[PDB]
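Hey,

Quick one before I head out. I ran the complex with A1EY3 overnight. Inputs first:
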Amino acid sequence: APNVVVTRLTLVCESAPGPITMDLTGDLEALKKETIVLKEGSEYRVKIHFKVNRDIVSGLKYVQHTYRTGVKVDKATFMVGSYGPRPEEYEFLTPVEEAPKGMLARGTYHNKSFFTDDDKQDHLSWEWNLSIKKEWT
Ligand SMILES: N[C@H](c1ccc(-c2ccccc2F)cc1)c1nccs1
């Protein structure tokens, strides 16, 4: 196994009716067909779960590109930092944001995420899609 293994992404969202999560050790091609529903304007954080198996690592970074029709790609980079090896996964959470709101902001957002580091290692790259809706259903 590699030293760094990305295991899961969770959208932390107090107001959501149920868990919003994806197993990133699974089939990343199938993951593209999933659609996460977020009610417009909901507060959320992105939580990345990962394991460090063998050696202390430094300079971890989470990079998230969000595509939306008609708008320039939104590119966000987060410093994740240094972690030692242990059996239990670590969790990194982005700062809280407000999901888009209004009828013109509803519908599909396409995300491409990267877990990487100062050494530009591809710990994991993955796509996942979000649908912003008026209600949770
Ligand atoms: N600011 C918007 C934008 C940015 C991020 C998200 C988002 C990404 C992951 C989880 C939940 C989210 F709400 C949605 C909309 C964009 N502007 C230009 C392209 S995307």
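The pocket of A1EY3 is lined by residues 38, 44, 46, 66-68, 71-74, 99-100, 109, 111, 130 (CB under 6 Å).

Talk tomorrow,
K.
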